[PDB]
PDB file of C-alpha atoms and ligand atoms in Angstrom:
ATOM      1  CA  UNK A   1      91.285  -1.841  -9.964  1.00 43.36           C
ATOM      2  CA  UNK A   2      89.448   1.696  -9.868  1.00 43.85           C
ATOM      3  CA  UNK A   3      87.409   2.505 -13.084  1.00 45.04           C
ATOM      4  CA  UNK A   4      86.123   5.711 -12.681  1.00 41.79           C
ATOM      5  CA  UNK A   5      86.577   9.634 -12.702  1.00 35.97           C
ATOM      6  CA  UNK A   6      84.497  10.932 -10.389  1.00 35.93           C
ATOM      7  CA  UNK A   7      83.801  14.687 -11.388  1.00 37.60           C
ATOM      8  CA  UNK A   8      83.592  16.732  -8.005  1.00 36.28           C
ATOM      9  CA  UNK A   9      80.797  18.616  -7.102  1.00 36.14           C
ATOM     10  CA  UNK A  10      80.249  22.252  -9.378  1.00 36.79           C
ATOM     11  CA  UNK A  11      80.662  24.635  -6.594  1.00 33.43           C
ATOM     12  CA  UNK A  12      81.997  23.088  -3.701  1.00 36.45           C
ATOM     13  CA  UNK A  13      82.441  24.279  -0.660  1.00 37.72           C
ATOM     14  CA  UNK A  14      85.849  23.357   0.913  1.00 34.21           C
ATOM     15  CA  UNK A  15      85.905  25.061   3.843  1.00 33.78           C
ATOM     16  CA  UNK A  16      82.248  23.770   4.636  1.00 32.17           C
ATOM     17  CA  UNK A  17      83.380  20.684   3.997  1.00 30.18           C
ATOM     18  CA  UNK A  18      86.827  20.819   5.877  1.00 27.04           C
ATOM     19  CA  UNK A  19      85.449  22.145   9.028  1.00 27.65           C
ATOM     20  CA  UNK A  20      87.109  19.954  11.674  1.00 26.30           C
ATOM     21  CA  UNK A  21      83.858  18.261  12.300  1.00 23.78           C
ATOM     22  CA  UNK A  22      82.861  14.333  11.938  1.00 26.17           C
ATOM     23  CA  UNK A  23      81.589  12.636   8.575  1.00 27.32           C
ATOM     24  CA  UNK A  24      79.786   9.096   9.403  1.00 30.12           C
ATOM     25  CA  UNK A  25      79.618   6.706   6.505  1.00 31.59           C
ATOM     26  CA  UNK A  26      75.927   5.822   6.385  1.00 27.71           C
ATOM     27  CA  UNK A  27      75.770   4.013   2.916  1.00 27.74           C
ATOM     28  CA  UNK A  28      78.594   2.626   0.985  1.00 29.97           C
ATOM     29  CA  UNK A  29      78.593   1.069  -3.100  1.00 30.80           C
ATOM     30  CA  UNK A  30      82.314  -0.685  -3.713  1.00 32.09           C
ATOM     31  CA  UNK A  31      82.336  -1.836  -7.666  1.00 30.13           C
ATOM     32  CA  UNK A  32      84.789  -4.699  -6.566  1.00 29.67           C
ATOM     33  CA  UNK A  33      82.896  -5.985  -3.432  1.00 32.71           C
ATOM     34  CA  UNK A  34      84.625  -8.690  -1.668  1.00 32.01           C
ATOM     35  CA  UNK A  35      86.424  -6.084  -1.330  1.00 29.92           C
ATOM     36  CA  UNK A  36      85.130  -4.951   1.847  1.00 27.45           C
ATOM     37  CA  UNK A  37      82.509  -6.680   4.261  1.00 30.10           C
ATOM     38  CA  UNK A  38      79.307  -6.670   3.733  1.00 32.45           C
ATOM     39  CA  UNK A  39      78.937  -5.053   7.659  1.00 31.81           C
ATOM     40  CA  UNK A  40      80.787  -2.150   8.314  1.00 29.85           C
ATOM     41  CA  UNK A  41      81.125   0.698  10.273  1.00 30.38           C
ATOM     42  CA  UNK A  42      83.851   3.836   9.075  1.00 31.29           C
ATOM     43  CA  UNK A  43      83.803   7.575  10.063  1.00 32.13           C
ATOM     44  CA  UNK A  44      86.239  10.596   8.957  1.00 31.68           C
ATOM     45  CA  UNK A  45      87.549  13.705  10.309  1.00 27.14           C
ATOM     46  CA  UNK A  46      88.410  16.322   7.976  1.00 25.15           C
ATOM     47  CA  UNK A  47      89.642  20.068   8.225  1.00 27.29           C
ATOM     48  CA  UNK A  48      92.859  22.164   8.482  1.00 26.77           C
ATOM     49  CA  UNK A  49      95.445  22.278  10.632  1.00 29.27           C
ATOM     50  CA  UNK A  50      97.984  24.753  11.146  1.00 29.12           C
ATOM     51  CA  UNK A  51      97.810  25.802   7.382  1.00 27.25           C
ATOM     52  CA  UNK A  52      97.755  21.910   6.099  1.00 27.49           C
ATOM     53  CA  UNK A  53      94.963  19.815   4.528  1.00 27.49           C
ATOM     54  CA  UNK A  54      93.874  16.972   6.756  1.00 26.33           C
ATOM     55  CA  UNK A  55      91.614  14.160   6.844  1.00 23.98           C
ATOM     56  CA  UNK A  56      91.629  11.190   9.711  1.00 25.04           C
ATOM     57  CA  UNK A  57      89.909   8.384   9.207  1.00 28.68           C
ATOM     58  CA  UNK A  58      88.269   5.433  11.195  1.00 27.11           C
ATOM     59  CA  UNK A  59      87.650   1.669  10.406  1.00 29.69           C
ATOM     60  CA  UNK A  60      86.040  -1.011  12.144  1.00 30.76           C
ATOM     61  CA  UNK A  61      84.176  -3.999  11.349  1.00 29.86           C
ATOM     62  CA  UNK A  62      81.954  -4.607  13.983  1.00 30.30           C
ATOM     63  CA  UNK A  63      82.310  -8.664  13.682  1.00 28.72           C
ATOM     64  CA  UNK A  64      85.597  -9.309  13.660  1.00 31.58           C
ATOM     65  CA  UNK A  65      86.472  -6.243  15.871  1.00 32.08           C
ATOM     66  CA  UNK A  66      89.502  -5.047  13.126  1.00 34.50           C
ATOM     67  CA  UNK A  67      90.300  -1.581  14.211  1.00 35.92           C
ATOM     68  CA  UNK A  68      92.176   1.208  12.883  1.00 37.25           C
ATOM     69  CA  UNK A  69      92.900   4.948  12.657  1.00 37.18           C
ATOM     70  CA  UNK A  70      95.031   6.970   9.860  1.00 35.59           C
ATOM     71  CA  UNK A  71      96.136  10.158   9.414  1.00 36.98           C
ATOM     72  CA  UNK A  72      96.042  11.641   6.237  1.00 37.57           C
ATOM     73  CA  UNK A  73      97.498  14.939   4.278  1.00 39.62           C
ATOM     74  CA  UNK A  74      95.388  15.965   1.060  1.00 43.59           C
ATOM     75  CA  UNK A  75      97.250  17.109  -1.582  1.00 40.47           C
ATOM     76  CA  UNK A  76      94.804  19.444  -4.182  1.00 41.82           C
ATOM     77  CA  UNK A  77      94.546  17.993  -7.551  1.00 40.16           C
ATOM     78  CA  UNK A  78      91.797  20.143  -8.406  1.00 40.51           C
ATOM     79  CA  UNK A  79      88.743  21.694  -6.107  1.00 40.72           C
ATOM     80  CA  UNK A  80      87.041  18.523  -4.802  1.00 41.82           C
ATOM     81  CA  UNK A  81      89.462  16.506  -5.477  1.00 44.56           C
ATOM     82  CA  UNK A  82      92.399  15.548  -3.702  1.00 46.07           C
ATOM     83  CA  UNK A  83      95.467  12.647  -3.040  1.00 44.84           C
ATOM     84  CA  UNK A  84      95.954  11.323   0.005  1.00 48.66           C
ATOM     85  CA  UNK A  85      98.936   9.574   1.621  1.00 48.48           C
ATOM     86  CA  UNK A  86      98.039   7.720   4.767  1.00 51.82           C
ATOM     87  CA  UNK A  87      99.226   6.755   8.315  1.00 50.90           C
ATOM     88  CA  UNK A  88      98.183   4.307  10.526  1.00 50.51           C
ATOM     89  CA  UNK A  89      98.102   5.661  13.988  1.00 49.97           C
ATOM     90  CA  UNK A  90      96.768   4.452  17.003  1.00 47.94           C
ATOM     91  CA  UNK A  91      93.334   6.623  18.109  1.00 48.47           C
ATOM     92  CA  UNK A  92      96.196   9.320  20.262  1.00 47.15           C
ATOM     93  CA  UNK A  93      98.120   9.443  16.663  1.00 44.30           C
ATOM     94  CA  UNK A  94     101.347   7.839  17.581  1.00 41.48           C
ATOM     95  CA  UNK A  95     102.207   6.200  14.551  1.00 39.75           C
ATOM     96  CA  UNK A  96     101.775   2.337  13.549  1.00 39.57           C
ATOM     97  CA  UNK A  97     102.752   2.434  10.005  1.00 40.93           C
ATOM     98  CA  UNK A  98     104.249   5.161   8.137  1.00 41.85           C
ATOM     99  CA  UNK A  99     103.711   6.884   5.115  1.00 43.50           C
ATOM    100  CA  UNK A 100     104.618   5.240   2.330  1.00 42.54           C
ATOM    101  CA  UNK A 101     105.127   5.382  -1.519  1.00 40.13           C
ATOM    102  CA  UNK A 102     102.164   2.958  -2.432  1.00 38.45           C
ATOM    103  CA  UNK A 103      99.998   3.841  -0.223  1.00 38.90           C
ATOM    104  CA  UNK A 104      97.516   6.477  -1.082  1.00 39.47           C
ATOM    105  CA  UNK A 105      93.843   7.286  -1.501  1.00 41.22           C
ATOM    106  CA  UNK A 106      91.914   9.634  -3.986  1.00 39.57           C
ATOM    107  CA  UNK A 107      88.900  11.184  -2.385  1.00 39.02           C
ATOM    108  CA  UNK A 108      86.639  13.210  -4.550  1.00 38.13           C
ATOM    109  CA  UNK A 109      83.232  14.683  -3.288  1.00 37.34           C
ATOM    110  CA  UNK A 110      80.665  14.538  -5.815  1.00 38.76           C
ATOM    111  CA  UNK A 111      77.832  16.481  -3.703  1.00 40.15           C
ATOM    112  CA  UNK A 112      78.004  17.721  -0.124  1.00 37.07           C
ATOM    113  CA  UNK A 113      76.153  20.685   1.872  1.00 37.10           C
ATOM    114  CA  UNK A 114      76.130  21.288   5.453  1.00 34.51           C
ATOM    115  CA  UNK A 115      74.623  18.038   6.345  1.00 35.05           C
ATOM    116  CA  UNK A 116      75.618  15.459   3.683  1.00 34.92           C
ATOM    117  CA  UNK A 117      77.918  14.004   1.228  1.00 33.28           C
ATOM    118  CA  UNK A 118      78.445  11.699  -1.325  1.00 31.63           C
ATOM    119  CA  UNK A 119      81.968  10.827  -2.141  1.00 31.43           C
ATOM    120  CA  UNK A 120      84.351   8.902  -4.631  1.00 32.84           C
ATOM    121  CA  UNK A 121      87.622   6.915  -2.842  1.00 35.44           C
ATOM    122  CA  UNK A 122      89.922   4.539  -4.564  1.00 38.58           C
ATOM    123  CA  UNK A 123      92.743   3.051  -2.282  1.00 38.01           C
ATOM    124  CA  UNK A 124      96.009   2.014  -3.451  1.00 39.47           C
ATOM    125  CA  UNK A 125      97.415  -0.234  -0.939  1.00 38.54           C
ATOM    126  CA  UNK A 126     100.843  -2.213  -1.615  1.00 36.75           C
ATOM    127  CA  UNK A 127      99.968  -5.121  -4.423  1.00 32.56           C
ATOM    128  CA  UNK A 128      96.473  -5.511  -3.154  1.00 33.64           C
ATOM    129  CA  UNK A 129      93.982  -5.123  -6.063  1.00 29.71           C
ATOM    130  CA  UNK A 130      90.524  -2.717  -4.498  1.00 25.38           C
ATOM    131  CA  UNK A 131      87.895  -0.819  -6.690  1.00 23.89           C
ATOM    132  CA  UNK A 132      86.150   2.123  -6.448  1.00 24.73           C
ATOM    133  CA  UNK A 133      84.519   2.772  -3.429  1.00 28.71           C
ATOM    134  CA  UNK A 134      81.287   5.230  -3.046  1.00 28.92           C
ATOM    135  CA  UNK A 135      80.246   6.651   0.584  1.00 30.90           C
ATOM    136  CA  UNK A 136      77.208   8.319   1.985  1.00 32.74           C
ATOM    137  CA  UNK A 137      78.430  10.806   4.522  1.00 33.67           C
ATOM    138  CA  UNK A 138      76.176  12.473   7.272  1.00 35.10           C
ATOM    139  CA  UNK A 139      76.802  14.637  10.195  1.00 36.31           C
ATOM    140  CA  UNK A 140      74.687  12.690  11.799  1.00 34.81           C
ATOM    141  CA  UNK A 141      75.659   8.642  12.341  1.00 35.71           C
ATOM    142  CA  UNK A 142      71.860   7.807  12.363  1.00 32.52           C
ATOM    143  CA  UNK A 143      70.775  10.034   9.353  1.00 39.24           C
ATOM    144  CA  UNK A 144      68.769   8.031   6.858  1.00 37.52           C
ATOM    145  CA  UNK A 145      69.873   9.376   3.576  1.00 40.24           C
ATOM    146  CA  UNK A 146      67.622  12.300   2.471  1.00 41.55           C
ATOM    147  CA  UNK A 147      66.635  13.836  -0.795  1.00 44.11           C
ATOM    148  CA  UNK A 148      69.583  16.170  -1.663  1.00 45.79           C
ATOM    149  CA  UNK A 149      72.117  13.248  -1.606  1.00 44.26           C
ATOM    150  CA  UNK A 150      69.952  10.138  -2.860  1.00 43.01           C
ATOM    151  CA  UNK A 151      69.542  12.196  -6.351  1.00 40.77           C
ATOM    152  CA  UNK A 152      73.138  13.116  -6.352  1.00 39.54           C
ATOM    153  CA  UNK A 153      73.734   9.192  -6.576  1.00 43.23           C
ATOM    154  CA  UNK A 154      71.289   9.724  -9.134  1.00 44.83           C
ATOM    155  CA  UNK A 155      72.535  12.270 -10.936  1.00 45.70           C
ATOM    156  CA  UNK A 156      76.198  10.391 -10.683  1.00 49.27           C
ATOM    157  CA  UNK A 157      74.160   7.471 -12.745  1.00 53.55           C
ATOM    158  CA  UNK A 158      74.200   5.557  -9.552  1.00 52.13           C
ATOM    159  CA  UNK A 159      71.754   3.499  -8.161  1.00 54.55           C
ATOM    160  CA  UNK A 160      70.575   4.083  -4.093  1.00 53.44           C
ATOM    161  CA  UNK A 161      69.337   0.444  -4.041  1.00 55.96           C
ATOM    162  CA  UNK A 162      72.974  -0.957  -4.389  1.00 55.70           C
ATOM    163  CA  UNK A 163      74.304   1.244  -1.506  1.00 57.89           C
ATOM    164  CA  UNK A 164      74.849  -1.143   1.315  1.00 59.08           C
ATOM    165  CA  UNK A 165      73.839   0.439   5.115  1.00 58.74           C
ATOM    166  CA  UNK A 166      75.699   0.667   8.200  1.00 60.91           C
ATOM    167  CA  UNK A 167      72.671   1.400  10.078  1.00 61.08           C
ATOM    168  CA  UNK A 168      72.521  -1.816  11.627  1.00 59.49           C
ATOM    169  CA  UNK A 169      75.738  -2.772  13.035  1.00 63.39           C
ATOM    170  CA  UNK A 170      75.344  -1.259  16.344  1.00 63.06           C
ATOM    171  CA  UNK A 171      78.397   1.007  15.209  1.00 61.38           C
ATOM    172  CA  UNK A 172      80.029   3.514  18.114  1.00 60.57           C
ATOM    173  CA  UNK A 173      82.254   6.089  17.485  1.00 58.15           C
ATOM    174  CA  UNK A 174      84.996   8.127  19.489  1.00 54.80           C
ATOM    175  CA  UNK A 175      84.623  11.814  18.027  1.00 56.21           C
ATOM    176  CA  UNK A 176      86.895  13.136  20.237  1.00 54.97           C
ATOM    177  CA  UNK A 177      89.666  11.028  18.804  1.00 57.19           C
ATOM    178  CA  UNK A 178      88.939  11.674  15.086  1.00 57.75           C
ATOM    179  CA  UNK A 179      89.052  15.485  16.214  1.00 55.80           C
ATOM    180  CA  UNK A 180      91.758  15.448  17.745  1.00 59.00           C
ATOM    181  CA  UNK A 181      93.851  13.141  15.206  1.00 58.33           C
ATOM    182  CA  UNK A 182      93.642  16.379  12.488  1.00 59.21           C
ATOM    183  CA  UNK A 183      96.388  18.003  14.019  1.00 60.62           C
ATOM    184  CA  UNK A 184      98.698  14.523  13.872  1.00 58.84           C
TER     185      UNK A 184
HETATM  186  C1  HEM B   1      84.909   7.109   4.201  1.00 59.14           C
HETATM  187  C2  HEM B   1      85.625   6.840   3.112  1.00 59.14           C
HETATM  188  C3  HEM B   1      86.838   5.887   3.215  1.00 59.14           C
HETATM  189  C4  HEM B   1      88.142   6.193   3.060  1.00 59.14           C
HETATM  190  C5  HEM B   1      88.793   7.542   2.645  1.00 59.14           C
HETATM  191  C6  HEM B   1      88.890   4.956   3.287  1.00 59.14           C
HETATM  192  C7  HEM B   1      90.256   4.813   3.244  1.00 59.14           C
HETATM  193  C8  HEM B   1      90.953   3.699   3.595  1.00 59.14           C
HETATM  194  C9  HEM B   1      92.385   3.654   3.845  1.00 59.14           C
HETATM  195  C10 HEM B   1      93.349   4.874   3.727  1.00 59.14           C
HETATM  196  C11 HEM B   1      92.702   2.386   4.160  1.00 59.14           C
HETATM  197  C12 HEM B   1      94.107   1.802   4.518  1.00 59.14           C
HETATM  198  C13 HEM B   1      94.394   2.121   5.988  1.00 59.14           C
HETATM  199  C14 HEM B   1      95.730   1.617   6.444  1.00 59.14           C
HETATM  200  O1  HEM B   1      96.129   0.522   5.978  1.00 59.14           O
HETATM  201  O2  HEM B   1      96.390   2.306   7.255  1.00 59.14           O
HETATM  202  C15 HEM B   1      91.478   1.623   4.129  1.00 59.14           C
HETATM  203  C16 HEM B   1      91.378   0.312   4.412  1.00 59.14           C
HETATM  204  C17 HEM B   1      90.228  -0.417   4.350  1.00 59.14           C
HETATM  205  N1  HEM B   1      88.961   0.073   4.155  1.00 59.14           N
HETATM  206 FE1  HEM B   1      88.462   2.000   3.868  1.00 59.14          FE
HETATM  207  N2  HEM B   1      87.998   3.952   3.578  1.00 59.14           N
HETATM  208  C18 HEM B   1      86.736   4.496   3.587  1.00 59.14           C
HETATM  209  C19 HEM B   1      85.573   3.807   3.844  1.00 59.14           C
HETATM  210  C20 HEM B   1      85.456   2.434   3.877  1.00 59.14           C
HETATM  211  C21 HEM B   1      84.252   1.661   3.843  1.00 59.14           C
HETATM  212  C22 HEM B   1      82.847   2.238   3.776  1.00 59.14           C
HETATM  213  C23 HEM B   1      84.552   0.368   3.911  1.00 59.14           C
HETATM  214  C24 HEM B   1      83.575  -0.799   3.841  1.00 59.14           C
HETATM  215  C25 HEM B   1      83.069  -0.952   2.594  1.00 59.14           C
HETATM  216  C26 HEM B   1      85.974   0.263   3.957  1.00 59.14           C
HETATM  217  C27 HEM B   1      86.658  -0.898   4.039  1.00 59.14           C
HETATM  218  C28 HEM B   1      88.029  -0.972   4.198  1.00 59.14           C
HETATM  219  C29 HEM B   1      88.734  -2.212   4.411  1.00 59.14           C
HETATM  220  C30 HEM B   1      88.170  -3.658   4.538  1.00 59.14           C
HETATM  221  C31 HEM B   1      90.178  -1.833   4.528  1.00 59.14           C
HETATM  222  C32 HEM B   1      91.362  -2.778   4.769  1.00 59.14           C
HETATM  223  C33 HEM B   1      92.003  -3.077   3.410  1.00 59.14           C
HETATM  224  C34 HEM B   1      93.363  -3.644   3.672  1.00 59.14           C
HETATM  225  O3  HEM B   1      93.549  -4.336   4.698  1.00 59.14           O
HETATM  226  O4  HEM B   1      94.267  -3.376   2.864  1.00 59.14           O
HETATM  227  N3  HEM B   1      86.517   1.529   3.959  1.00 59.14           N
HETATM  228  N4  HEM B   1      90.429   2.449   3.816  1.00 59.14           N
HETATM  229  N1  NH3 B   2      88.428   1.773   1.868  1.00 57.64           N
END
């Protein structure tokens, strides 16, 4: 179960932050861990498209080879934060499994600026029982975590030495897909 409120970050920027462009997951803290693998490799799109609010998402764990894509709308609960429904697409967006009552994520973002994030998700999934989940975002997938976002874990009474890395699991990425996926 998910504990926490996470407060978004004073300020924020949406538009900066819904640009259209790629998010990498660099670092990731999940309070109920086996949860989620302890390698992993995830990356979001987010922006908006024709008028709507739009993240798309990607998953893979790079030892089993589990793959998948979703679609997402983002309705505003307040600035920063935000509930998602989800699809799961295929990378083209055709659609795998629809949107369903059930299935949603929250997705708050606790710091970002033009470079980096740090975010709050909790997924609701059918009768499956997941925590809170923390992320690291960069524009960049190789970006070691710099100074602005390792005190905003900080400052969220977080510690950087929990986060878990994806630095090392070879991960690739098709940015072209995420992109495109927005408008789906
Ligand atoms: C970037 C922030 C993230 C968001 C918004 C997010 C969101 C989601 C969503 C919506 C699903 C369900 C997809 C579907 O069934 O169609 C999901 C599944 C999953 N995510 Fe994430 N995720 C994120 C990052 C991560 C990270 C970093 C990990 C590794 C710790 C992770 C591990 C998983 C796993 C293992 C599942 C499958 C759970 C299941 O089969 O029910 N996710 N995620
Ligand atoms: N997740």
């Amino acid at each position: 179960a998910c504990t926490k409120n996470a407060i978004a970050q004073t300020g924020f920027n949406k538009d900066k932050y819904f640009n259209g462009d790629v998010w990498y997951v660099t670092d990731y803290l999940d309070l109920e861990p086996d949860d989620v693998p302890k390698r992993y490799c995830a990356a979001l799109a987010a922006g908006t498209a024709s008028g709507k609010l739009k993240q798309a998402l990607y998953h893979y764990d790079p030892k089993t080879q589990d793959t998948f894509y979703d679609v997402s709308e983002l309705q505003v609960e307040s600035l920063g934060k935000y509930t998602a429904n989800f699809k799961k697409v295929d990378k083209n967006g055709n659609v795998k499994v629809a949107v369903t009552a059930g299935n949603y994520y929250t997705f708050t973002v606790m710091y970002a600026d033009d470079s980096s994030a740090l975010i709050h998700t909790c997924l609701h999934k059918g009768n499956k029982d997941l925590g809170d989940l923390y992320a690291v975002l960069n524009r960049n997938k190789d970006a070691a975590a710099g100074d602005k976002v390792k005190s905003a874990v900080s400052a969220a009474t977080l510690e950087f030495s929990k986060f878990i890395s994806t630095k090392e699991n070879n991960c690739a990425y098709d940015n072209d897909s995420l992109k495109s996926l927005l408008t789906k």
